[PDB]
Structure formats: C-alpha cells, structure tokens
Amino acid sequence: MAETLEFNDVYQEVKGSMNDGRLRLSRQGIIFKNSKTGKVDNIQAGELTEGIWRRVALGHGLKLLTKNGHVYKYDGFRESEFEKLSDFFKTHYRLELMEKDLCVKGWNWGTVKFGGQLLSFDIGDQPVFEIPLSNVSQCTTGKNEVTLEFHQNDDAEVSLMEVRFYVPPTQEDGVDPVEAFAQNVLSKADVIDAICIFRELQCLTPRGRYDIRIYPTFLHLHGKTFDYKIPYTTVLRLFLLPHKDQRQMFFVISLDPPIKQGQTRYHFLILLFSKDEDISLTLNMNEEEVEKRFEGRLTKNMSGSLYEMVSRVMKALVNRKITVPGNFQGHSGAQCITCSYKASSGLLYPLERGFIYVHKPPVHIRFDEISFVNFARGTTTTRSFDFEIETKQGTQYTFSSIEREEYGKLFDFVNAKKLNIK
Amino acid sequence: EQQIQKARKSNVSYKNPSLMPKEPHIREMKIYIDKKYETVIMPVFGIATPFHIATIKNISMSVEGDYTYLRINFYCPGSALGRNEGNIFPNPEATFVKEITYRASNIKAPGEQTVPALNLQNAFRIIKEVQKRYKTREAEEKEKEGIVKQ
Incomplete structure (x- = not known):
C-alpha cells in the first residue's frame, strides 16, 4: 500500500455542532484540519491504541482512543473507507x-461508564450513546436522579439542552449512588444559574407538585412532565390570602399573557402553603451582589415560613406589592366567604380594592370595574344570598350560596366601599 | 387444579444495525421518527440514538420566544405510575434515562428554508401520533388476548 492517504469528505462533531474538514493518514500519524474553526488536530502513530468503526448520524464514523486516554472522533466516511x-x-x-x-x-436502560471527559451509556456490550462530560454546564442531583445541563452552540439547530438519569439506590456502595455519579461527573467536567430553587410546592392551578427556579428576569416552573417559564414582565399582581380554617395560605400570581397548555390558558398561578411549613434558603449569589440587586431586601441566607419566604422573594423580584386581605372579617371570623361559582365551591376574598374568587376557575374583579351589585335572595330566607357582580364591561359574575350572617356583613362592607347596589 | 401462564417480551426498534434507516434528517441530526418500525432517533453528540416509542412515557413542548424546548420523558423505576406498574423492568438496578431536553432557535436563519423549532414541533406531533397508534394497538391486542370465540 501507499505510505500516505487523504480524505476530503470528512466531518468532525464539536459540542453537537458538525464541522467539515480534510483528513490525511501517513507513517507520521493522523492529521485532521477543521474548516469552520480552522484548527489542526494531530495524532502521532505511536499514540493510537484502539480504533472503532460505527455507523454514525452523518454516514459512518471512526473513533481513535490513544495512549493518553483521549478519544478522537471523525465522521463523513463511507462504508468502503473502513477496509482502507x-x-x-x-x-x-x-x-x-x-x-x-x-x-x-x-x-432506555443500560449501564453507564466513565472514561476521561466522555460518558458512555451502553447495554451489555453494544453502546447506546456517549456524552462528553466536558460539555456539561451544570450537574444537579435529586432522589435517585442526576441531571446534566449543557452549554449551547449557535450553529447547532437542534441542541441537546438537558438530560436526566434515574440512578437507583445501591447501599452496597455505602455512599449514595447519586452522589457518586455526581462526583464522577464533576471529576471530568468543567462546571462554571438560578437564584433559589424551591422543590415541590403544592399548586392548585395548575394542579400538582412543581419545583420553582428563580432567575433574574423570569421563573421556571418545572413539573414531572410539563414545564413553563413566566417572565417577571408578565406578572401583574401577587396575592397572599389565608384559608377559611386559618391553617393554610393561598399565594396567587396574576399572569399576562396567560401560560398556555394545549387548549387551556391559565390566568392565575395559585399556590397552597401551610403555616407550619418552614424552610431555610440560601441564595446562589454573594452578599454584595445581593445588596446591589435586591437593594438589601434579601440576604445571602434566610429562614422562616415557606409562604413568607416565597412572598418576600417574589416581592423583591417583581417590585409589585403583595396584596393582602382588607378590613373584612366574616361572621365566622374568617377573611372570606364560602360561595359557589360556575358549578364549583370556593372562597371569595374582599381585597382592599377588589374581589378575588379562588381557586377553581379563579376570578378577580376590581372595584372600579364593577358596574353594580345585587343581593338577590334565593328560595330560603336563610343562607341564600347570591352576591351577583356585574362589571362595566357587561360581564355578570354570580356568587351564590352564601350564609345569612355573611350576607349581612358583606352588606355593611359594600355599603362602606360605596358600590352601586341595585 | 392446573393453572395457566403466558409469556411476554420487551419491544425492539431494530434487531440489527442493518435495519437502521438512512434519512437526510438523521444525516443532519434532526429528531427522526420511523413510523413503520415505531422508533424515535435523536441526536446525542453526532450519535443518532434510537428509542422505541414504548420507552417514552410522554413528551412536552414549550416556546420561549427566542427558543423552543422539547422535553421527552421515558419510563423508569418510580416513574412507572398508573396501569404500567405491572410492566416491571427486567433489571430495575440499571441506569434509566428519565428525561432528555432539546432546544431549537425560533429565529429563521437568513433566507434559509425551515426554522429549527419547526423541526421540533413536527417531531412532537409525529411522536404523539406514533404513541397514540402504538398504545391503541397494544390495548387492542391486550383486550383480544383471552376472549372466548363465539
């Protein structure tokens, strides 16, 4: 055979972005030259150790593992180049x-192996895929779960943003296997974020447990399946309300535009907390940076009730003041009235400047938007006061099924607020 | 008295690499979906990794103005909630890939053809369709197995 060979249709994958270039083999070694980056890679003849050939995405592919524990990869070859x-x-x-x-x-199952800056997910003997650990921009852990967040290249149209691996428990290793996997990943990657991450918060609209990651200009609502991202520019109001039984707290966020999910749009983000649910949070920033950003409203380390923490954070972030219940106190001592609406029971809170009905299809009506009100009396003379509200736009909201004493108190309240009672 | 017991086996996308497809989407590293074989091939750093539609538990897609996020969740111990609990994995102690998220820019390149996010949207729709068909066929087969011919 000849002492030199050349190839002009060779490619090179770099952080998910394909790059073309020329390749040449000779007794001196293997020399590749990238075109987009203009780099020149060289592998001496005395460094190669293992050579693998496999059908990759772009045609076929060669994988050269050298004595230095480093593995180079080339693509763009044909099935006939393997023999040569x-x-x-x-x-x-x-x-x-x-x-x-x-x-x-x-x-979607198999074994994981570490080797240099590259991770390999395989099954028995045939590999499933490989992940260069050097491209990981962050590595987080959870309950039998590890998550790798990568960087992003402009040329990569379909960039792999985030991956997650379910790591089962293995008490034989002594240390948590999740922690072991995280350490193995950090030993090879070069990690460089969210301000604070609340894990699992009871949400009512949407329903289910969702973690919340805070960012300087938005918040990431991560779920077990669906995810959303709400910029602070879309927030309108923050409402912190108590529960009728005086045991829970409702935290409502008014959105605009509403987050969409298929064929449904949510106008409010409702969260439910317990007064006895404390927490201790530590920001991902330094003291001076926090002082410059939040102007001292927050600190590097905080502790207190969970709802209080969420309220403080959202306030310091949005600058909008959190609305709180007004001077209303029902006959039962609660700060709301239990009433029905759109075939669903719920709680109506007279805020300082409007009403808000939660939580099933929630509604919010400001005093200025109300055209008039009507204390319709249902069938009975006891616990049958429908507090209908017609707005200046023409929409009429019917809040039916209200106790008699609640109606008497709301009557005095509306007379104090001075609203058009028809 | 006597009893009865049946067998079963996991799904396979391609029994051999020779059965792998050869499409320009795969060449360009675009999330491809083979319907005849019911498989989803996704790019993993120049590696077109396939996954049978059965492995995927669900998929979600989000648009963030500048970028679009496509999340794909598979089945794994702990996540096999619902009527899939009986689908005990053959080795629950192995590593299960539970989530994979891809990101595509919504900006149309200068006078180019399609937009990267359009590819993710098309992939989402096709995966939903394939999953619907696969689940329909599986339900049909499961309800036919055990009927007394009349």
Whole structure:
C-alpha cells in the first residue's frame, strides 16, 4: 500500500455542532484540519491504541482512543473507507480498525461508564450513546436522579439542552449512588444559574407538585412532565390570602399573557402553603451582589415560613406589592366567604380594592370595574344570598350560596366601599 | 387444579444495525421518527440514538420566544405510575434515562428554508401520533388476548 492517504469528505462533531474538514493518514500519524474553526488536530502513530468503526448520524464514523486516554472522533466516511483504514492501520500502526455499531434495539436502560471527559451509556456490550462530560454546564442531583445541563452552540439547530438519569439506590456502595455519579461527573467536567430553587410546592392551578427556579428576569416552573417559564414582565399582581380554617395560605400570581397548555390558558398561578411549613434558603449569589440587586431586601441566607419566604422573594423580584386581605372579617371570623361559582365551591376574598374568587376557575374583579351589585335572595330566607357582580364591561359574575350572617356583613362592607347596589 | 401462564417480551426498534434507516434528517441530526418500525432517533453528540416509542412515557413542548424546548420523558423505576406498574423492568438496578431536553432557535436563519423549532414541533406531533397508534394497538391486542370465540 501507499505510505500516505487523504480524505476530503470528512466531518468532525464539536459540542453537537458538525464541522467539515480534510483528513490525511501517513507513517507520521493522523492529521485532521477543521474548516469552520480552522484548527489542526494531530495524532502521532505511536499514540493510537484502539480504533472503532460505527455507523454514525452523518454516514459512518471512526473513533481513535490513544495512549493518553483521549478519544478522537471523525465522521463523513463511507462504508468502503473502513477496509482502507483497517489495512493502513495494520500495515503502519500495528492496529486493526474493528467495527462496533451502537445498540439499535431502542432501550432506555443500560449501564453507564466513565472514561476521561466522555460518558458512555451502553447495554451489555453494544453502546447506546456517549456524552462528553466536558460539555456539561451544570450537574444537579435529586432522589435517585442526576441531571446534566449543557452549554449551547449557535450553529447547532437542534441542541441537546438537558438530560436526566434515574440512578437507583445501591447501599452496597455505602455512599449514595447519586452522589457518586455526581462526583464522577464533576471529576471530568468543567462546571462554571438560578437564584433559589424551591422543590415541590403544592399548586392548585395548575394542579400538582412543581419545583420553582428563580432567575433574574423570569421563573421556571418545572413539573414531572410539563414545564413553563413566566417572565417577571408578565406578572401583574401577587396575592397572599389565608384559608377559611386559618391553617393554610393561598399565594396567587396574576399572569399576562396567560401560560398556555394545549387548549387551556391559565390566568392565575395559585399556590397552597401551610403555616407550619418552614424552610431555610440560601441564595446562589454573594452578599454584595445581593445588596446591589435586591437593594438589601434579601440576604445571602434566610429562614422562616415557606409562604413568607416565597412572598418576600417574589416581592423583591417583581417590585409589585403583595396584596393582602382588607378590613373584612366574616361572621365566622374568617377573611372570606364560602360561595359557589360556575358549578364549583370556593372562597371569595374582599381585597382592599377588589374581589378575588379562588381557586377553581379563579376570578378577580376590581372595584372600579364593577358596574353594580345585587343581593338577590334565593328560595330560603336563610343562607341564600347570591352576591351577583356585574362589571362595566357587561360581564355578570354570580356568587351564590352564601350564609345569612355573611350576607349581612358583606352588606355593611359594600355599603362602606360605596358600590352601586341595585 | 392446573393453572395457566403466558409469556411476554420487551419491544425492539431494530434487531440489527442493518435495519437502521438512512434519512437526510438523521444525516443532519434532526429528531427522526420511523413510523413503520415505531422508533424515535435523536441526536446525542453526532450519535443518532434510537428509542422505541414504548420507552417514552410522554413528551412536552414549550416556546420561549427566542427558543423552543422539547422535553421527552421515558419510563423508569418510580416513574412507572398508573396501569404500567405491572410492566416491571427486567433489571430495575440499571441506569434509566428519565428525561432528555432539546432546544431549537425560533429565529429563521437568513433566507434559509425551515426554522429549527419547526423541526421540533413536527417531531412532537409525529411522536404523539406514533404513541397514540402504538398504545391503541397494544390495548387492542391486550383486550383480544383471552376472549372466548363465539
């Protein structure tokens, strides 16, 4: 065979972005030249150790693992170049390029292996995929779960943003396997974020447990399936309300535009907390940076009730003041009235400048928006005062099923607020 | 008295690499979906990794003005909630890929053809359709197994 070979249709993958270039093999070694980056990679003949050939995305692909524990990768080859590569390596490098396609059975389970700056998810003997750990911009852990957040290249149209691995428990290792996986990842990656992360918060609209990551200009509502991102520019008002039984707290966020989910749009983000649910949070910032950003409204480390913490954070973030119940106190001593609406029971709170009905299809009506009100009396003479509210826009909201004493108190309240009682 | 017991086996996208597709989307590293074989091939750093539609538990998509996020969640111990609990994995002690998120810019490149997020949207729709068809066929087969022919 000849002492030199060349290839012009070779590619190179770099952080998910494909890059073309030329390749040349010779007794001196293997020299590749990228076109977009203009870099020149060289592998001496005395460094190669293992050569794998596998059908990659762009045609086929060669994988060269050298004595230095580093693995180079090339793409853009044809199925016939394998014979040439193997013959050249066997005649000059004493190596035989062997084929080793990836697992094509399509299974989301297998084993994980670490080697240099590259992670490999395999199944038995055939690999499933590989992940260069050097490209990880962050590594987080959870309950039997590890998550890797990567950087992002402009040329990569479909960039792999985030990956997650469910790590089962293994008491034989002594240390938590999740912590072990995280340490193995950090030992090879170069991690460089969210201000604070609340994990699992009882949400009513939407329903379910959702973690909340805070950012300087938005908040990431992460769920077990669906995720949302609400910029602070979309927030309108923050409402902190107590529960009728005086045991829970409602934290309502008025959104605009409303977050969309298929064929439904949510105009309010409702959260439910317990007064006996404390927390101790530590920001991902320094003291001086926090002083400059929040102007001292927050501190590097805080502790207190969970709802209080959320209220303080959201206030310091949005600058809008958190609305609180007014001077209303029902006959039952509660700060609301239990009433029905749109075939659903719920709580109506007379705020300082409007009404807010929660939580099932919530509603909010400011005093200025109300055209008039009507204390319709239902069938009975006891616990049958429908507090209908017609707005200046023409929408009439019917809040039916209200106790007699609640109606008497609301009557005095509305007479104090001075509203058009029809 | 005697009893009865049946068998079962997990799903396979392609029994051998020779059965792998060869499409320009895969060449360009676009989330491809083979319907005849019911498989989803996704890019993993120059590696077109396939996954059978059965592995995926659900998928979600979000638009953030500048970028669009496409999340894909598979099945794994702890996440096998609902009527899938009986689907005990063959090795619950192995590592399960529970979530994979891809990001595509919504900005249309200068006078180019399609937008990257359009590819993610199309992929989402096709995956939902394939999952619907797969679940429909599985439900049909499961309810036919055990009927007394009349």
